Amino acid sequence: SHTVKIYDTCIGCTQCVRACPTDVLEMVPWDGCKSGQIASSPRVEDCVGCKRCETACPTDFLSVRVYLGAETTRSLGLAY
Amino acid sequence: ANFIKPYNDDPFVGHLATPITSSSLTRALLKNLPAYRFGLTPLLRGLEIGLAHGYFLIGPFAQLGPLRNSDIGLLAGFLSTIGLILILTLGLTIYGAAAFGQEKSNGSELQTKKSWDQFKGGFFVGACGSAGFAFICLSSIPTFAL
Amino acid sequence: PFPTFGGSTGGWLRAAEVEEKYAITWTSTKEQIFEMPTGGAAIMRNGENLLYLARKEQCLALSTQLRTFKINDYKIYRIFPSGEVQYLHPKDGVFPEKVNPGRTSVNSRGFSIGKNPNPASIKFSGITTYES
Amino acid sequence: WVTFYWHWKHMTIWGGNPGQFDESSNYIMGWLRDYLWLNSSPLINGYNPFGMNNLSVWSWMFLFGHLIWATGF
Amino acid sequence: SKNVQVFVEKDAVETSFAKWAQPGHFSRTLAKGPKTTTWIWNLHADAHDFDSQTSSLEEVSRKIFSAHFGQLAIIFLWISGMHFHGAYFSNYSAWLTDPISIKQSSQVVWPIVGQEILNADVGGNFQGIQTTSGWFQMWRAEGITSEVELYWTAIGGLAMSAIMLFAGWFHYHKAAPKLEWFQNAESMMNHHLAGLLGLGCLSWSGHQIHIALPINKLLDAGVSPQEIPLPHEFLINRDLMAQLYPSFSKGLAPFFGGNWGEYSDFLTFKGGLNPVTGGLWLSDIAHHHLALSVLFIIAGHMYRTNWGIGHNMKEILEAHKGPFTGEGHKGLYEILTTSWHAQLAINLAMMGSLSIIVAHHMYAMPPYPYLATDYATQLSLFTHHMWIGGFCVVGGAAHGAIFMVRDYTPANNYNNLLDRVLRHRDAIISHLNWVCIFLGCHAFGFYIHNDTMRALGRPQDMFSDKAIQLQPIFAQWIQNIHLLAPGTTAPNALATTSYAFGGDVIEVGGKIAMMPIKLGTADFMVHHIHAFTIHVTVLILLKGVLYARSSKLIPDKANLGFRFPCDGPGRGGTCQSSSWDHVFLGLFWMYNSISVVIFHFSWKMQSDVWGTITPDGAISHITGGNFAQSSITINGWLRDFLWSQASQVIQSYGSASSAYGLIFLGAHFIWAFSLMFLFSGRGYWQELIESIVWAHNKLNFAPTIQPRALSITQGRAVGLAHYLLGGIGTTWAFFLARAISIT
Amino acid sequence: ATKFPKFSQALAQDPATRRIWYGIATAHDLEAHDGMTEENLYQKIFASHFGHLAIIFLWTSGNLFHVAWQGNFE
Amino acid sequence: VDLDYGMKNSYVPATGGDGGQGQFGAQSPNDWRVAGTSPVGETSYAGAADGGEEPWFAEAISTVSLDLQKADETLKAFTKDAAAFKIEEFAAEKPYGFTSSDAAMEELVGKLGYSKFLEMSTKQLMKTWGT
Ligand code: CLA
């Protein structure tokens, strides 16, 4: 459904993965930052488009960007 | 005593067993209604439903329509009812096409194309005929006086 | 192993029976009252507990509450109409907020957000700048 | 604003009293009372408790417009 | 020891001006300092939210008690000013002599910039603004007579204001009560229901029986105000009272004995309205308060305190449970004794509801001398109290929601009434939605149908008293019941409680005070519209309370708070999903509801009640009875009401009513101004600000407190505020200007 | 696509009523349709213009006809 | 367990503007667009639940559930690869008297259950398997 992309400016603060309401983001090993960790979006099929993740990023400009797109039952948050 | 319990004993389904939802009265009435009754063929189900709805529809038009005070008011009311029945029948036809498709197999399941078509046909006949019956009845009203 | 609840009109609907359904499980050390996302209050059982919901978010919301009770053994599954089940969370056994060796990066662009291509350049291509 | 100006100016000219605009256009109340209020009398009486005239269709549309506008809100 | 005791902490807070110089001290976040303009706005928006400023109920409670003293001080100063202005800047004396001709005025403008035009020739060799609050009538009923007395009550008011302010300081800085003291509901109710209300009524009855009644009788008879004996004289010379009411001769002997009948001279159940003044008989009012006093005092002895006898509210609440309601009312006591928001909800709703009742009962049964004939005052009071009520009711709902989000605890509420309500919320909201649609389609449809029919030249097909008719049969029936009550179901009464139900036309000064108000098809149509408006308001507000903590869309709304802008652009859009936003939308519907009600009052009265009657029986209503056949169509309201009754404001220039014209226009402007906040978004504004800041920077200067755009929530608030001010303001001027003329 | 918005798979695969609403309002943005080449775009636009011209002429024809058949020009 | 059951759906990702099937598929294999209620003694939604004498509320009769025993299997299958990586690393770090990966797994999971095994660092594992 929606598209979430992570950029090299990430600092591995883990704040984004701790804010997702649907477990779409994970922290994976990396060497480009001091923390030695980067964020990934393995399960974008469950993204609802809340953008809470973006609100949590501390980088000058979001290192995590959510681009809204095709809509499915899951993305539209339909319990019915 | 608790008169409200989880439906089907499932504490997580979105429904509750209230006196209104599950009382002998409600169960009995719904079981014997033409729509859910057992044994009725698709055509007969439609017929009963149509007979019921057509009889009460002639009233509103006949007593409150544009030509209510005219001598031909009842006739006009009948025509108006027939028009409404046609509109509703179009809806039924269209619904069936979209919901069921083009070729069916199960058969005798109100929820199939063939069965739905039969159901629709019954409704039309029953409704129009019922409206006609009301016309005959409303032509001369009994005072039931001895 | 269902927790003690009296029922609500905010439970699951047909989609749960014809499209897809979810289920969360956890273990408790005491019987305590929690608030369910559907609406209302329920009492968990002293031991295994299972509850069904219609959305993953509803399940994960409850997990947050569970963490307050110091319960961190929750598991979430998706049950399809045919009976097939998918284990969803914690997927690898380790919560996502904790780096677990063995997880690969996905959807990562190796440049600052400002280095994406110009829209005009990719015209009549079908791709987007952020996917280019 | 542009259309209101054209109409009121011309209305007064056609009516033979160019002075009304010349003096009442200087303040806002003039526009409301000597233009919108005064010239709405024919319209709001298209249909009344005593009958109707050929301006009925125009009267009805006026109210219809208000409805759509507010519904937009 | 004793269940009910007084616990107070001495010298709790030091009095100093240090915190005054540290704006934002109350908040941890704001205290750090201003970095953007948002800090400024937040300072003002979180000033009185004590729950977020401290985590201890005792502290929050202490602040509330003291803050209340502050409001009381302000109220006292307000009343004091009014009496003073009525002593030094009014024509009360002249009006007192000729109430029918002289017009009430208590405000005078300085002769600056032609504003003097606003000083009208009210009468009595006096020029000023015609006030419409009804002070003169009240003072006459009390028996003021002089302006010296008004001065003294003003001084008393100032003194009282000071005492309250001291009390606030004292009970917060020097003697602050502890939480245990506050949590004594039974005692509080016993005291407030027997002391505040019971003793209050009894005391008032004393004034009315010994001072007001006698003086007013003399005034009505014709005695010149100067010739009426001073109040103290009546209190001392029993003989004087005996002359007026021939029972004081017997003294209090009849009272101690069981012969209360002898006091029938001043305690009566006459009913109806005094023919001379057009107001309720004071004798009846005196008996009213006396009777109420006894009732309240008795009621104040129902709850247990420190002597065993009495009721414990907890027990009463818990016992009331049934087969369909689980644990019943268990858990409610704790909620109402541990949550200020919950208490405010109930109290605020009831207070607002009372105001609406006051409005209805105070016009049908005019309570003051020479009030009914003053159409301006009557209209002003009805509308004023109708509004105050609407706001308060919506406020109750708001604080109810704040409770659910901040104080509700699942543990303390298992299978109680509250829990069960939140467990079938879908059913409740679904059904109410339908009810609203049903009512709205049918009720408003009637009007649209009629408009179309009249425009198509088919008047015989309209829903009118001359065609298809929809008569209010039930209401017509109740009216008859109330009309025939005197002498039957109410044997000892002498007349109808109100002439509205039926009776004769009471006229004072050639003007109609009250007349039977009849109900027909038009009334049916309007009443059902009122139902629709109120029902929709409840839907929005109730939905907010029930879905405050969670929803299928946002399962964790509680954590987000009571006032969050949204959850995001996802799920298809989650804008305005907070409970605060539900209150935001509810206020708009409350505005609509009240507006229609006040308009109904204005047109119905000016058409079927108010007016003049000749010496013989010829009644000429102000508008001429147009309500019956014109209020059945929307065009009728636009033409026969708004367009026609607005001729006064629009033509007020050059007169003492010019102010209303200017305000009418100003209010329209503010209403429109608000639509820019309600339709736009923060994004556009923030970007515009960026460009503007560029200019300032280009000239080597820019504020350190970086300029930022108003928050999403604030934008909505600013819009609603201006919208309400503009709309209400417009009607305010419209009504007042029209009323002045009709009077 | 196999649903209403044939020019958009994204909207077509939507399980809600949005599919219908958006398909109607995104119908004439030919540039964003799935699989659109510049040549086709220009060609379709050219043809669409012919249709608009026809509508304008039909409109004018109607005014003349109705005035002539039901008017008082003479 | 068919780990691809969800992935095997009718959804077809679009060119641009779609995340894709993700990790567990974007949509249910089954179509939600089924029929409505049916008369007594009839079924509508294919493998639907008979409503008995209350066909009107048949949709409220659950037929989809989770077997606790089966739940264990799905947990193991979906986390098989992770377990493999974990044990592999443990093996790489010169295990004391190592035997076979599988054998080690059984021994290491005999103790420390399975969930605990998945959440333990190779270092902790080696310490645990010192014996
Ligand atoms: C004139 C402007 C206008 C109108 C007509 C409406 C209409 C409505 N609003 Mg609304 N609203 C408005 C302005 C308006 N709003 C503004 C400015 C705001 C901002 C505060 C809101 C905020 C708001 C909220 C927050 C809520 C509403 C709700 C409602 C609905 C009430 C239910 C009802 O009576 O249905 C009847 C609707 C009618 C328009 C009645 C007239 C229609 C005819 C006369 C009846 C018969 C027509 C028939 C059905 C079809 C005819 C066929 C043919 C015409 C094609 C209704 C759809 C409530 C709602 O949805 O709950 C139900 C609700 O919660 N409104």
Ligand code: CLA
């Ligand atoms: C919504 C309010 C409303 C109502 C009640 C009416 C009523 C009427 N209109 Mg009118 N009209 C309205 C709005 C309304 N109008 C609006 C908004 C417009 C503008 C578009 C018009 C324009 C209009 C025209 C142009 C004409 C009318 C006409 C009529 C009359 C014919 C009635 C008819 O044929 O209905 C038929 C009704 C039905 C077939 C069904 C009625 C609904 C049923 C009774 C509900 C039953 C519910 C049931 C109790 C549920 C429980 C069941 C359980 C116990 C088993 C009637 C007096 C005609 C006329 O002669 O005027 C007098 C006419 O020519 N109307």
Ligand code: CLA
């Ligand atoms: C509800 C309270 C209330 C209200 C609304 C009014 C309103 C009015 N009074 Mg009135 N009055 C009141 C109570 C009230 N009064 C009381 C209780 C008394 C008894 C003391 C009086 C005694 C009184 C007299 C004797 C007179 C008025 C007059 C007036 C009118 C002119 C007001 C004025 O001075 O303008 C001009 C305003 C000023 C000169 C004040 C200067 C503005 C100050 C400096 C701004 C405030 C500074 C700010 C708070 C700094 C903050 C510091 C921080 C520590 C808080 C006005 C209609 C006058 C009038 O009608 O004359 C015809 C007049 O002569 N009143």
Ligand code: CLA
């Ligand atoms: C019989 C005793 C008594 C009386 C008269 C009151 C009266 C009042 N209480 Mg109260 N209270 C009492 C006992 C009493 N309480 C007890 C025992 C408790 C503890 C359980 C409380 C706890 C309490 C709280 C927690 C609060 C109140 C509040 C209030 C006020 C409500 C606002 C109102 O109606 O304005 C009416 C205003 C007036 C009538 C103005 C006059 C007020 C003075 C103080 C009356 C005192 C008597 C007076 C001097 C007459 C003496 C008679 C003499 C002339 C012969 C009101 C003044 C609220 C408030 O706003 O307090 C500030 C509030 O928050 N009370």
Ligand code: CLA
């Ligand atoms: C008994 C009355 C009462 C009391 C004690 C409270 C108390 C409270 N309310 Mg509440 N409320 C009430 C009535 C009341 N309310 C009513 C009637 C409504 C419906 C409109 C509301 C709606 C409401 C909302 C929606 C919210 C509160 C909130 C709050 C809390 C913080 C208030 C705050 O931010 O202070 C600061 C106070 C202000 C900034 C008000 C200043 C006045 C503004 C600027 C309007 C002025 C209009 C003015 C009269 C127009 C003059 C025109 C002239 C210029 C020409 C506090 C516990 C807030 C909260 O967070 O609760 C926890 C919150 O979100 N209340």
Ligand SMILES: CC1=C(/C=C/C(C)=C/C=C/C(C)=C/C=C/C=C(C)/C=C/C=C(C)/C=C/C2=C(C)CCCC2(C)C)C(C)(C)CCC1
């Ligand atoms: C309120 C209620 C109720 C209900 C009621 C109702 C709702 C009723 C209805 C009724 C109805 C609604 C009925 C109907 C009827 C119908 C009919 C009776 C019909 C008939 C028809 C016929 C007989 C035939 C026709 C025809 C045809 C078929 C075709 C051909 C032609 C002809 C004509 C032959 C009751 C009482 C139960 C109880 C209580 C509650």
Ligand SMILES: CC1=C(/C=C/C(C)=C/C=C/C(C)=C/C=C/C=C(C)/C=C/C=C(C)/C=C/C2=C(C)CCCC2(C)C)C(C)(C)CCC1
């Ligand atoms: C207007 C006003 C005001 C007010 C004033 C007043 C209100 C005065 C009065 C005062 C008074 C003048 C009071 C009085 C009181 C009295 C009373 C309250 C009485 C009581 C009684 C009793 C207590 C009795 C008892 C008993 C009995 C029961 C019987 C037997 C014997 C005995 C004794 C035991 C002020 C200025 C504040 C402010 C402004 C406004």
